Amino acid sequence: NVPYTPMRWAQDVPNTGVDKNTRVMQLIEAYRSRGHLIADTNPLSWVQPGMPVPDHRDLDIETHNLTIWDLDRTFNVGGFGGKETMTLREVLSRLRAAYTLKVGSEYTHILDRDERTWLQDRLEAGMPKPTQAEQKYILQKLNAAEAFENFLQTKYVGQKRFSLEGAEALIPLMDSAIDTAAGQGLDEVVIGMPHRGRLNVLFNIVGKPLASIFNEFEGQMEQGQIGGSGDVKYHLGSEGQHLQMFGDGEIKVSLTANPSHLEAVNPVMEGIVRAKQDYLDKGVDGKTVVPLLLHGDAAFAGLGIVPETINLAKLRGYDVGGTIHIVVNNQIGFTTTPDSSRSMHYATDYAKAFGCPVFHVNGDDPEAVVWVGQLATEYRRRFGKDVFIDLVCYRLRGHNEADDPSMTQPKMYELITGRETVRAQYTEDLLGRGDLSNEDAEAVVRDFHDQMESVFNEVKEGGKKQAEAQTGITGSQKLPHGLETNISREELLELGQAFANTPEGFNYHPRVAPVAKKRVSSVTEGGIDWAWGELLAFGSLANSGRLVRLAGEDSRRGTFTQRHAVAIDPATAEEFNPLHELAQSKGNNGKFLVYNSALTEYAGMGFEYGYSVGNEDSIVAWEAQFGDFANGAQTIIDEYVSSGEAKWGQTSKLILLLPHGYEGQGPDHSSARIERFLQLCAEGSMTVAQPSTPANHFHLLRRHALSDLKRPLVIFTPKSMLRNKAAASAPEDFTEVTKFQSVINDPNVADAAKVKKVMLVSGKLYYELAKRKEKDGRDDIAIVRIEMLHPIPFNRISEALAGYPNAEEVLFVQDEPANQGPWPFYQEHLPELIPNMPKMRRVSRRAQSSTATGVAKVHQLEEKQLIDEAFE
Amino acid sequence: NVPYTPMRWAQDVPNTGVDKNTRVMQLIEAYRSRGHLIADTNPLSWVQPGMPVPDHRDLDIETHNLTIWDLDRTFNVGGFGGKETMTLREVLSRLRAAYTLKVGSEYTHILDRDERTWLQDRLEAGMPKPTQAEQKYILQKLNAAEAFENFLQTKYVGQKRFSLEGAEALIPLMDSAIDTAAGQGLDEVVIGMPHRGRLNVLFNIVGKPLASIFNEFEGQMEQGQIGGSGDVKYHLGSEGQHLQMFGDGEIKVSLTANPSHLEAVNPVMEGIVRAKQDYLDKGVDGKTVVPLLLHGDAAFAGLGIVPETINLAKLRGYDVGGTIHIVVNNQIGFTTTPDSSRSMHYATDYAKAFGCPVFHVNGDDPEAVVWVGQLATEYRRRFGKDVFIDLVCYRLRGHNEADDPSMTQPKMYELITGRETVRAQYTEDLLGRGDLSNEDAEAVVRDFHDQMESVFNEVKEGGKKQAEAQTGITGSQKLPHGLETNISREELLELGQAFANTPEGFNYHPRVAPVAKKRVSSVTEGGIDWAWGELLAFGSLANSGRLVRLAGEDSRRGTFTQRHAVAIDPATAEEFNPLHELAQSKGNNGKFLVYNSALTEYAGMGFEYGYSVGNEDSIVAWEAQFGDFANGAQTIIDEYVSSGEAKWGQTSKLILLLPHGYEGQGPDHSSARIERFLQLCAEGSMTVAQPSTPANHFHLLRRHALSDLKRPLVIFTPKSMLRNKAAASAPEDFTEVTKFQSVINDPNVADAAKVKKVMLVSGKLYYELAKRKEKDGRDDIAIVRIEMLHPIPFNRISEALAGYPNAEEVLFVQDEPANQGPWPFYQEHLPELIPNMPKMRRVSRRAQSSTATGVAKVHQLEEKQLIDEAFE
């Protein structure tokens, strides 16, 4: 059992052509670059049959024209090993000690010279010898891991737990990293991980009490929100403290919640970290919250969210100072082996796309594992980049504890069954080297088992409760009754004047200057448009002293060239952000931050959700270029935004701004899928709205921000109505009107006793129907608008209908096809809530498989037909 | 304007320590590895302000301790340049000619020695000088590109076309690659691409007639399917032939359809290629259909589908012999620059994760572009791997032709406005070197313009038609009336006996052997379960002579350990596929292929959709581990599967198998979201079903396969009912019953005149209600099952209800919450279709924000409450 190729027999060759010193230097470079391909990193003696084996002919002395006859000759090595001269025997020895034992490293692809040299120096110095105290501490942690698993196996046989057996070195690795961070003087560590070994991490790393875990197994679950539904035990989070064992340091540790969908926690936990860093506010030399992110091998290589999130690491609005990644490589999926899971040689090969180091380490050598953890944390602190650790281990049982792995992997499980554990091997080693006594070794085991037995008995004394029905979360938060959302006239003029206080030598671009002038004049003359209404809202909130953050694709200028939140000087390329300046000059320390995102919907929306969870007192908004591209973030919508409160008791106030409208641009630029969002709504989970005037948009946003109802808000925003002159607002609407309106009654009804038809509408189609009514002089019709779709304002709708006593019909008019838009929701729910209402009649486009037509002439024909049908 | 750092002044150094020959060898290695960092590949003199600049101190002679005094001395270079000895002046010259001009290359990261040597030899030989005929051909192609764009600009000013101006070298690049493929003797080239320069490629590469394009601009659109909706002009496909200009070769060229959602065509076009290769059947040395895939720079780096699809390249069921990728790098998104779009240095850095070569080429040197195209196609044919080309160019106008790019990028568009085009520069060069006459140069322009003017006038003679309403696609395909789907008794016994004809020294695993025995005995005794019903269907179809393909996560064994389509011997690890063997021994050349996929839903389902389009006569099925994870492939469901026929006239017969059932495993293992699929259905777009017996599943699959209705099928499959003994089927049900049943009436009604309540149900809840009915001895109830959900079988439901004349109530019973499951669809549609039916009454779980509870005791309590409510 020796791992190297034996020395071969050959004749001595002459020192001609390429000199032999040159050849020895090439051998050194080869080992530094490709030595990991023959390192002792696999605990099993296993090669997967279907996988290609890389060429490693570069690592034998024959390929560099050297021979056994050169082993005792001396050569110039140019500072290798801190020496100017050396023999080939000593060169080989050192290279093999550094690059071919229990740690394999990839770092030569890095472009910066100082980085490379830092890593090179530390790897060739070697792992320092630990003290006896340190060694005993590692043994305690290994014991705790294995003991916990065995206890649960004994007391609860069939139950699903996803064990960590085969990979117990994870516990001392994570502990090493957290301990190093505490020594550096940082503030917090945030963890995200999957199912494998979660209960073990909760107990041994975070410090969740043992009584809680046992209760979970007996069927008593802790409640997150009153009347909540809940979730399985391996999807929950917690908080705790960590004290340094051989130091005076202390750090906070947290673990976040997540669904079954693998790798969906990656963008969410990045956002949490960024929000926490922003709150502490320590500048560029800060970055004092550390992200620690665990993965599995099959998921890491397969799912595309992983590289998508790593791509945000060095960008202006997303940087968090680097992430420490750990891949638990147990060499198997569920019943699938690496030959069917990836086309890369290693699972961690995405690192080479981003220019980051990789360390592969054997999971049966605990001292090496602890060293690698420390080295990774130090690299992050110095260089501020991502680092990747690959922990090579195995899975002792099946995927779960009810499965038989021999059916599909017979040969692999001949090697696994009947091995001795990592705890056993390490205990044997220490006793052998005289580093530990037998009395000590036995006490370590006995003490921990006594602790667990004690707690278990205490838990079983208390009787088991019986099941009870879950009520719901509808009334678990209060509504802001009697809150006023108007600003003063002084405040409105100051906001307007922010676009005139340009810096010293700044000028606007010729096509932007008219927009700025209109903003200064409108706050006293009238004609405020949609975009200026939105900015007035965010600006007012920033003045009061809040952190406002807006992010999305092309969101600084706007997709429709309407926002201009940051302006650029054509001559010098200087930037200017008016509202941020004004906020910072009022002494409440408010901020207005605007960012252009990368081209992602899954990672984009995920990051913003996380930001909302990490700072409860911030105002966050994500924008989509068109609302049609939001289906690329469906996982986030379904698993976090819509259902997080009911499952885990995690609350959020994220705002989604989704453009919407039927205007003839085709099937992927028309519909944000209102029907889909209205399906997800129940128990008052989130608010859904589609306002028709800038002032109403203003009032909706401000109500959300100033209330104490912590639930999301989804707004369907316009595209062509942005520049419609009939939709503009007057200043009195921002300063004298006090509240948001959920239903707006018809403002052009002469006599209410002559009305015989009522039309209900939502959004931009109002302005077409009103136009036609005026032209044809109809005094028997009344158009009523619905601004808030969910929850249903049935009291106001009832009040409006009651104002027209001679009405005979009610028409529901929408632009969308009959199987889309708000009609399906309303035809089901509204008749029950208003019993005395006449039967409703739909007027819309026909039902379709696609969203809209692709021909523009057909769109125009359809619209004419629709409005004609509405007016008999 | 010289691009190199000037030589510096210094003293001559002694030849001590590390020898100078060693230093010259290190300089050679540095240029081969990192020389691309200073190459002349950018047409503009532009450096983006916010982006980090890599260290390139490795490329100057000072860092290797050499000096101007070494330039004329001679050194040993070990075969570089085919010489044993050389001067430093000549070494620098050659290195700079190979790695620092108009082509920059990355290839040193490749692990195989033979690959590296092949590339190294060709790059250092250089680009061969082209003939005069070849040169004139390049000029014709450049002219065609620019001329086409200018014509459209003149005749249709405002209209959106997404121009290729700034990147016209794409046309000769694509032509070079296709021409090389024709010379190799291959069969077809399949193209997938986005919006940028699509109309140009359709005309100049594929050969779509010019009349068609002009008609599109005037509003007349070609119809795909009768009564279809359509799509915009830059989302369409076509077919054509390509003849070799200087050869006797000929090849077929195709371009596929796609939605606005970027990069969603990647898995689809890979599947198309694989299906076409499988049909030709030329073995391992074949792979004679070439995939050519175009991208944009922002999308390539940002979206996660890109690396997810590249990961399938070398896997057993997905390999297509390599893909040629072209990234059109115009150094801008919409209004977003690279500093805000990616954290990688180049856009093509994912290549280094997979071990593939990259070529960067200047878009203003057409001869270099043509060379790179040829070299890439040759590399693919020899090594069978992916290759990446980065074409560096610019965007002349704004994102579209109605946008002003100066507002956000002032300085960049000072360099762009008023340049001379690539056609102009190349014409000037050829006239300068005396390779072309002026008469020739003028004819090239005049002839093409005359051709375009001719066609345009012809198109405008014919009058413009007026718009007309679009009818729908419901009746555009026929239904299989009077088709019988039963097999003979001889056929059924043969299928059963396939599991007894094991190979020579093969034995089953002990826990699999009972399943095989039961399969042999059941085809005569009874008790056929769900899994055996499914396999009997696919097996029968394979025998008749069809290619049957099944793919999904853990689909060979099955998630619930139920399928065992391929078995493994514990002693030798040999594999056995019974049904494939039987099919191949019947002389119709049928196949049964089963594959375990990687852990992806987006790339997985996309690949199978593509396979169905590439071979219309195959049976394809994609399976999900649980139906809850299908929301990760929402883009494919919404943009291709549900709506492809209505938009482009592209038909498919894909089968989706999605597990479903409420059994107490929590919110991410319970619901496949039936309500969402039923929203998407309209115009008879696809079939949706939930059968309750194995024989019915058999008949449904066979009807789909043998009919001439080319639309998808979505089936909701069971989890616990797989092993329910009350659900098993007898052999007569496969051989004497002739058709699939859409409604199954109650088989335990003694007297029909005593029934006073009718219950409607679908799926596994039937077996609970029937159980209770028998226990309590209720003769006033009748339970009726609905097997096909869409389209609605209203004639059969009416017939069933008419059989109970004294019925007073109708109850709709489901397990799902009230805002989920089939209730929303049915409460809307069914009362209209059956006017005389009593009012329906729902019996279900309450409406919820999440899918299901997380506690198991609560699940049991809910189920009891539900069934009690049903029976008064």
Ligand SMILES: CC(=O)SCCNC(=O)CCNC(=O)[C@H](O)C(C)(C)COP(=O)(O)OP(=O)(O)OC[C@H]1O[C@@H](n2cnc3c(N)ncnc32)[C@H](O)[C@@H]1OP(=O)(O)O
């Ligand atoms: C969805 C959520 O996040 S909370 C929903 C919780 N409640 C329910 O779902 C109960 C069922 N729903 C209902 O009874 C109704 O739909 C209601 C009460 C929510 C609204 O019906 P109406 O009375 O017709 O609407 P109206 O606009 O008059 O609302 C009255 C008050 O509720 C407040 N309100 C209503 N919806 C919201 C909301 N989403 N956020 C904040 N305040 C709200 C209004 O500000 C108003 O306050 P006021 O006392 O100053 O007038």
Ligand SMILES: CC(=O)SCCNC(=O)CCNC(=O)[C@H](O)C(C)(C)COP(=O)(O)OP(=O)(O)OC[C@H]1O[C@@H](n2cnc3c(N)ncnc32)[C@H](O)[C@@H]1OP(=O)(O)O
């Ligand atoms: C969804 C698609 O891809 S095709 C749908 C096209 N047609 C429509 O949408 C029209 C509206 N729908 C309807 O009229 C009804 O729902 C129908 C006719 C489709 C079925 O209603 P019923 O008559 O109650 O159902 P029933 O099961 O008796 O169907 C009768 C025949 O239709 C055939 N059929 C019905 N649905 C399908 C289907 N999805 N695929 C194939 N054949 C079908 C049956 O095989 C049967 O053939 P038979 O004459 O040999 O017995």
Ligand SMILES: CC1=C(CCOP(=O)(O)OP(=O)(O)O)S[C@H]([C@](O)(CCC(=O)O)P(=O)(O)O)N1Cc1cnc(C)nc1N
């Ligand atoms: C395919 C799959 C698993 C295999 C993971 O392999 P690897 O990453 O190597 O991990 P490890 O097991 O080696 O540590 S676990 C898991 C599942 O969902 C796990 C349960 C859960 O995490 O909720 P299951 O119950 O269906 O098996 N599952 C189904 C699944 C599929 N696709 C997604 C996106 N998410 C999933 N949860």
Ligand SMILES: CC1=C(CCOP(=O)(O)OP(=O)(O)O)S[C@H]([C@](O)(CCC(=O)O)P(=O)(O)O)N1Cc1cnc(C)nc1N
């Ligand atoms: C963000 C975005 C575009 C920029 C692409 O930049 P790059 O990849 O560098 O290409 P190029 O333009 O430099 O060649 S084009 C496009 C859009 O949808 C294009 C239209 C279309 O392709 O259908 P739009 O009309 O909203 O701008 N769009 C919106 C968009 C967003 N997200 C997805 C998944 N798909 C999209 N179509």
Ligand SMILES: [Mg+2]
């Ligand atoms: Mg694994």
Ligand SMILES: [Mg+2]
């Ligand atoms: Mg671009």
